Amino acid sequence: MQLVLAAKYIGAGISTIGLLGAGIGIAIVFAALINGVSRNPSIKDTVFPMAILGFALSEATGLFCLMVSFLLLF
Amino acid sequence: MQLVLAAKYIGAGISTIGLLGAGIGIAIVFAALINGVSRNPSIKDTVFPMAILGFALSEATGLFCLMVSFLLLF
Amino acid sequence: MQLVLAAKYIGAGISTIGLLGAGIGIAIVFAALINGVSRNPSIKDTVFPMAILGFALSEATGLFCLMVSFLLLFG
Amino acid sequence: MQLVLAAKYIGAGISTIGLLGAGIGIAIVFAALINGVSRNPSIKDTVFPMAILGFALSEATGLFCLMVSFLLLF
Amino acid sequence: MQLVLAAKYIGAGISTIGLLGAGIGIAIVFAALINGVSRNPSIKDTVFPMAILGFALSEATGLFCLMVSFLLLF
Amino acid sequence: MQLVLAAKYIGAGISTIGLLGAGIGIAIVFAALINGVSRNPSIKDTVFPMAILGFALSEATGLFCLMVSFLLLF
Amino acid sequence: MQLVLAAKYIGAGISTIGLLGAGIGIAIVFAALINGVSRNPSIKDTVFPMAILGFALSEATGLFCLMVSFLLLF
Amino acid sequence: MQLVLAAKYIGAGISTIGLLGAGIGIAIVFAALINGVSRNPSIKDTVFPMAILGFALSEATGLFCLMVSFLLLFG
Amino acid sequence: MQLVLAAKYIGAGISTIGLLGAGIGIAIVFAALINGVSRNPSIKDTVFPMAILGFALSEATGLFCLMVSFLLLF
Amino acid sequence: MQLVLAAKYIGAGISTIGLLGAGIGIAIVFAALINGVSRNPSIKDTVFPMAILGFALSEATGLFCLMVSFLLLF
């Protein structure tokens, strides 16, 4: 049991690595939003919902990693 | 039995690392969408479905990783 | 045989890491498609099949990874 | 008990790797803010709250990593 | 002989990591092809063979990884 | 107690990896500052405080890594 | 002798990771070739040998990795 | 005590990995400096001190890594 | 001796990882050369020696890694 | 004594991974040099020393890694 528990904990730590993708990804979406609005302010109401969708989908991948982490911890 | 179970849990954590590619890839697609629409609002109905296809195919690679993760966990 | 089995499962996990390349690559191809069409809408029918070929070739590298993963899991 | 404790401390260290994602992502958001404002100073009041939101969401991913780290440590 | 076999299977999995380089590289080549053709449609016949060559040479690096993988697996 | 101490020192080293995110992110912010000022010198006073804020927030992610490192070291 | 053999096979797998560098690098060279020729078709005969040289030198780095792999295997 | 010593040396090695960030970051700052000056030579005296500050802050992250490395090697 | 030899071999494999930097770096230099010459063919004789220096310096870092590999192997 | 020596050699190999940052960073500097000179040949005497400074400081980070590698080896 102690070896299995040990592995659960190492596994949980490893499972957070993939969240780096969402950290970068969310930023890339928001960077495009800012650059898009700066170049064409009139487009703001069109691209803002696209940014919200983009960030939500990128974030979802990190949440998949976190779910695995929590399953290993709990 | 103990060591094998330990390995499954370590393996499950490692199998989520690949999800970072989808986290970044989804963002790259949505960034291109936002930048393309800002530069040419008239093209939005054409490029929006391309973004959905792009996102889905990128996400599919992360779902393959998750698949292996859940096979190892369960 | 516990050691060998343990190694198969760890190895199977490690074998999925390379799929991040297809995750990023497929996105890069589709981003170029979107930016290309935005800049020159008339080129769509020319570049769309290029993007399909591009995606499929990038994805194949990831499917090689997954193939090794399944060989370790099941073979 | 030594084995589980060992795993907690190694897991806690591994759990910080994902913070590199927020390190880079936060920067990408602020780079976009600076480049967007330099190109179009009049847009500053519009894009600045977008940058705050982008930073916060990217930062959150790194906070989920740190959460797992602190769970493993404490 | 169990330790050696274990090592072969660990080694085989590690040997697939480098395939990420071809996944990204093949995409980079196709991205340039699409962007080049969009900017200058008349150049299509000239640059398409360049893309095929670039793709093949990038893919070859992944195939060297896969070769080592299968040497280790079998 | 030797295994646990070993784990702390391994964990402490692993905990510095995430600092690469701040090394790159701080540079990305300063790169945008330099490029923004080169393109529009009149904007210097506006964007410099944005760069300071972006740098601090990126650096904070590395400082969270270093915090875990020192918790493990001492 | 089992321990040394094990290390040779794990070392051989690790030795292929560096090939991702050539995978990406070769692609970067060919992307530049395609973009340069699309922008200026008349320059093709000048830049094509530059691309062959660039590819070869980037590829060489991956070959040094494969060399170590084959030394460890054989 | 062999195990603890072994761990110090492995840990010291691992602690240098983060220096790749300063390697890349310092370069990024200097590239921006070069491109900024090329595009607008008159801005040189304004942006050169920004690049020095930028490099030094990026490098500090790597020096934190190396600090942990030396603590493990010698402390 | 067998454990030390085992470690030499793992160490050698790990020491090739850093060559990925030269693989990418050499390519980035050659990409700039190609793009520079395409935009301004008249500059070719000026930037070609800069490219040779750039690639040589980037390559040197990979050669440092390879030297460590060889010291561990021989 | 055996395990400690084993660790020094594994540690020495790991300590070269960081050199990839210098491999990439040196290239990024020289790419900017080439692109800046191509766009504005008249600035070459000004930006060339900036490139040398940039390269040296980037290379210094890789030399720090190598330093640790040689301390572990010798």
What secondary structure does DSSP assign to D18-53, as a single string? THHHHHHHHHHHHHHHHHHHHH-GGGHHHHHHHHHH
| I61 alpha carbon, distance to own chain's centre | 6
Classify burial at A45, counting beta carbons within 10 Å of its beta carbon; exposed 0-12, middle 13-18, buried 19 or more.
Answer: exposed
Angle at H16 between CA H14 and CA H21, to 5 degrees: 120
DSSP state of B58: H
DSSP state of E18: T
Tracing tokens 């490893």 back to the chain, one arrives at A14
E40 has a chain C CB within 8 A of its CB:
no
Classify burial at G41, counting beta carbons within 10 Å of its beta carbon; exposed 0-12, middle 13-18, buried 19 or more.
Answer: middle
DSSP state of D21: H
Partner residue facing J24 (CB), from I1, I11, I25 = I25
Mutate to test the interface with C, among E4, E14, E15, E20 (most CBs of C within 10 A): E20
Angle at A33 between CA A28 and CA A37, to 5 degrees: 150
- Joined tokens for residue J42: 């008249």
Taking the alpha carbons of D63, D68, D70, D71 in that order, is the dihedral positive or negative? positive
Q: In chain J, what are the domain boundaries?
A: 2-74
Contacts of F68 (CB under 8 A, 6+ apart): D12, D13, D15, D16, D66, D69, D73, F15
J13 has a chain I CB within 8 A of its CB:
yes
Taking the alpha carbons of C38, C43, C49, C53 in that order, is the dihedral positive or negative? negative
Contacts of E72 (CB under 8 A, 6+ apart): E8, E9, E11, E12, E15, G9, G12, G13
Instruction: Name the H helices within chain F.
Output: 2-14, 19-39, 44-73
- Joined tokens for residue C15: 């074998």
Q: Given an 8 Å threshold on Cβ–Cβ distance, is C12 in contact with B54?
A: no
| E67 alpha carbon, distance to own chain's centre | 12
Determine the number of helices (DSSP H) and then strands (DSSP E) in chain H: 3, 0
Question: Residue J4: which H helix or E strand, with range?
Answer: helix J2-14
- Joined tokens for residue D17: 């790797």
- Joined tokens for residue F51: 């760069």
DSSP state of E15: T
Question: Which superfamily is assigned to C2-75 in CATH?
Answer: F1F0 ATP synthase subunit C (1.20.20.10)
DSSP state of B43: G
* Most distant pair of Cα atoms in chain C: their distance: 62
Partner residue facing A33 (CB), from D18, D24, D50 = D50
**CB of E28 within 8 A of CB of G28?**
yes
I26 has a chain J CB within 8 A of its CB:
yes
Give the count of Cβ contacts less than 8 A between chain I and J. Answer: 156
Q: Considering only CA atoms, which of E45, G37, J47, C36 is closest in space to residue I39?
A: G37
With helix as H, strand as E and coil as C, how does chain I read? CHHHHHHHHHHHHHCCCCHHHHHHHHHHHHHHHHHHHHHCHHHHHHHHHHHHHHHHHHHHHHHHHHHHHHHHHC
In the three-class reduction of DSSP (H, G, I as helix; E, B as strand; rest coil), residue C67 is classed as helix
What secondary structure does DSSP assign to F22-37, as a single string? HHHHHHHHHHHHHHHH
Question: Which superfamily is assigned to J2-74 in CATH?
Answer: F1F0 ATP synthase subunit C (1.20.20.10)
- What is the spatial distance between Cα D34 and Cα I13, in angstroms, rounded to a whole number? 43
- What is the spatial distance between Cα E54 and Cα G50, in angstroms, rounded to a whole number? 14
Contacts of G18 (CB under 8 A, 6+ apart): E18, G61, G62, G64, G65, I16, I17, I18, I19, I20, I23
- What is the spatial distance between Cα H47 and Cα A22, in angstroms, rounded to a whole number? 33
G24 has a chain I CB within 8 A of its CB:
yes
Experimentally determined by:
X-ray
What are the backbone angles phi and psi of residue J17, rounded to the nearest 5°? -55, -45
Q: Considering only CA atoms, which of E18, J69, I11, H20 is closest in space to residue G68?
A: I11
- Joined tokens for residue F14: 């692993």
Contacts of I54 (CB under 8 A, 6+ apart): I29, I32, J26, J27, J29, J30, J31, J33, J34
Contacts of F29 (CB under 8 A, 6+ apart): D27, D30, D31, D34, F51, F54, F55, F58, H54
**Number of other CB atoms surrounding residue B41 within 10 Å:** 14
Tracing tokens 């690595």 back to the chain, one arrives at A17
Angle at J2 between CA I71 and CA J6, to 5 degrees: 40
